[PDB]
Amino acid sequence: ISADQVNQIIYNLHHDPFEILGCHLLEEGKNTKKWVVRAYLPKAEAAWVIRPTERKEDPMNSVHHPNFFECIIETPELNHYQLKVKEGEHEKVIYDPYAFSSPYLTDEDIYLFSEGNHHRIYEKLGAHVGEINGVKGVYFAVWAPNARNVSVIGDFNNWDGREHQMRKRNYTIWELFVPEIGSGTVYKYEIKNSEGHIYEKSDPYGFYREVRPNTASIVVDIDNIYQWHDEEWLEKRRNSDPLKQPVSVYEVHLGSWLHGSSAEKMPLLNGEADPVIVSEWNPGARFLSYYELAEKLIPYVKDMGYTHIELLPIAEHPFDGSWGYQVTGFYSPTSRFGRPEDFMYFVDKCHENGIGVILDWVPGHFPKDSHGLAYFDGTHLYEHADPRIGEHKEWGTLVFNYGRHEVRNFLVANVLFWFDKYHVDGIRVDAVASMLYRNYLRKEGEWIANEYGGDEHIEAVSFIREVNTLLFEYFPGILSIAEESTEWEKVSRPVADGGLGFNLKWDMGWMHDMLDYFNIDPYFRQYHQNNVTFSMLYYYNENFMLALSHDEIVHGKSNMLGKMPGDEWQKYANVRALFTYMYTHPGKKTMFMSMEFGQWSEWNVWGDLEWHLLQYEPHQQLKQFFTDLNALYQQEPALYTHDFEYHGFEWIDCNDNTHSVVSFLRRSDDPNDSLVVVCNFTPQPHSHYRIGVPEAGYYVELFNSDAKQYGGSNMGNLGGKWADEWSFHNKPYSLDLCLPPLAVLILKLDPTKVP
Ligand SMILES: [Mg+2]
Ligand SMILES: [Mg+2]
Ligand SMILES: [Mg+2]
Ligand SMILES: [Mg+2]
Questions:
Q1: Same domain for 286 and 388?
Q2: Running DSSP on this structure, what letter comes out for residue 749?
C-alpha cells in the first residue's frame, strides 16, 4: 500500500476504508493464493494474524505509520482468522472489523455454508441491521431449500407478507432487504411448502424473541448494544491452562434461584420492561432480569468464593418445566430475563469480579413445537428423516441430522456464537450418550447399525470432535465439559489422540458412589469402604469434574440434608464431611444452588430457593463452611495444580473399613505445599489415631469440618500436632491425631514453627 492511501485512512479522508482494510486477494498461484490483511489499530504497537484452524500465527508489520499494519499470507483460502492486537502491556484477540463489506450473502458465504464450514454464518443468516442501495434497513435471510415460497411477516406490514416475498438464492436460501425498519422489529417467516400449506416460523438464527408463550423473533443490532470491559479477563483466560487452576462451580437455574414481585416492572440495564410472571399458579412472583441477577447473584457468588457460575440452558426455550433442555431459539438468550444486552452485562460483571461463566448447551435434540426447527421447509430439514436416528421417542423430541452440512453448520457456528458475542468461558453438554449411540433408548429391531455394523453414531462423533477442535482453536483457555454415562472412552482427551475433545468429564460413578455411601447408616459403611476408594482406580483415564448437580436433588431423591442418616446434627455433619472430601479429592468441583445453605426441600423449578432458611444459625453456619472451603481451595495449590497427575495424590491408608477412616496426601510443585487429609465417616470420635506423614515437623490443623463455627462439636487438635519419629503406614514419621466425629481434617507442615 502507498503512504498516500495510509494517510487517507489515518486522517479519515478515505472514501471507503473497506477498499483497503480487511482481507484482500493479491494474486493466484498454481496451488495457492497470496492475500494481504490490513488493519488500522490506533494505539497498538504490534499485531498478528492468527489462523486458528491451521494453528498458524503471522506478525503484522507497520507500514508507513506505526498504527497501520499489513500482513501478507499465502494460503488457498483465508476465510477464518483473528487479529491479535497489542496496546502497551495488553493483548486482545478479535475478529477483523473489516471482514464483511456488505450485509448480504456473498457467493463465498453460500459456498462455505453449503459445505458446512461457515464459522460466522450468523453474521449473514437471521436478521441484521445494515445498508443496501444507500438505504438503511434490515437484511433477512433463511435456509429453506424446499420451500415453495417464504415471506417476511411482522409488525411493520401488519402480518401480511404479500409485499415482502423473499428471493431465493442458489436454490437454497431466501433473502430480503426491508428499508427503514431497525432493531426492535417483531417478525416471523411465513413459509409455503411443496404441498401449498402455509405456516409461520420463528427465525432459526434470531437474536431475541418475544416472551414465552409468544414466539415472534425480534431484530437486534447485536454489535451496537453493549460496551464490554473484560479485556484483561479474556487475556488471562487465553494465556492460562484452566486444568491447572482452581475450578469451583456454582450451578444455577436462572428462572428458580430468586424471584421478585410481579407488582412492579422488571428493571433492565438503563430501562425496564413488563414483569414476566413465573406461572399462572404463582402470579405474585416474577423472574429477575439478567441485570438484577448481575446485581444480586454475582456478589453472592463472589462472597461464597466460587470461581465459576454454570447456567442451566439459557437459549430460548418455550416451557419452564423443561429446565431449558428443550430449546427452540438457539441463537438467543431467553427473554424471560430481559434483553441480549442485559445478559452481556451479566457476563461482563462476572468477569469484572473474576468469575467465569459456563453455559449448558443443548445440541442433542430439539422439541417438535411448530414455531421451532421441526419439518422446517416441509421436509425433515434439521432432523434426520428416519425416526430410528431422527427421533428420541421416549422424550418426544427430534434429533439433528449431524451429517447434513448446513445442520452441522448451524450447531458448530452456534457454539462459537456464544463465545464470540457473549464472551462465555465454557460450555457443558448433558447426556452426550444420546448423541453418541445409534441404539440410544431404542428397542431391538427399531434402530440400524452404522456402515461398519456397530452402534456408534458416526456423524455425531464427527460433529462433537469438530466442535471441540474449533472451540479450543478459536478460544484457547475455555472449558468444554461433558456428562457421558456409558463409559465411552477418551471423552476428555484430544481429538488427535482418538478423543472427543472435551477437557473435563463429570465423574458420574463418583457421584453415585458418594451419595450412595453417605445415605448408608454409619455403622454399615464398613461394608462399603469400596465406595470411598473405587473411583481413584479409573480416575486418570479422564480429566474428572466432581459434580453434585441439580439432577440429584429432584424427583424424590431429597436435597443433601435429607439424604443423610441420623439426627439433625449428624445430617449436617455428614454434608460437611462429604463436601470436605469432595473438595480434597482430586478433580474440579461443581455443586448446585441450595446445597450451600442446607435447603431441606428438593429443588422446585417453579418456585425460588428457600432463602428464609438463612435467618437461622444452622443454615448460616453451613454457608460459612462453604465460604471458607472455597477460600481454602483457592489458597492451597496442592488442591488444584496436580489434579490430573499421579504426583498430586497418594493414599496414606484406606484399609481401616471397620472405622470408615481414610487418609491421603495432596501435592503440588513445592513440597512444602503438601497436605495431609484425614476423613472420619462415622460419628465415633477418636482420641488417638495414628497417621503416617512423610516429614518431621509441626502439622498445622489448617481445616477442620467439625469446627464450632460450621456447626460442629469443636473437637480436634488445638492448632496442630508435632509428628513423632514413629514409623507408620510405610512412612518414617506419624501424627497421633484426635479425629472429630463425621469430619474431615486437612493438615499442613509449617517448616518454620519454633520447637
Ligand atoms: Mg396473510
Ligand atoms: Mg441424564
Ligand atoms: Mg456396593
Ligand atoms: Mg420462594
A1: yes
A2: E
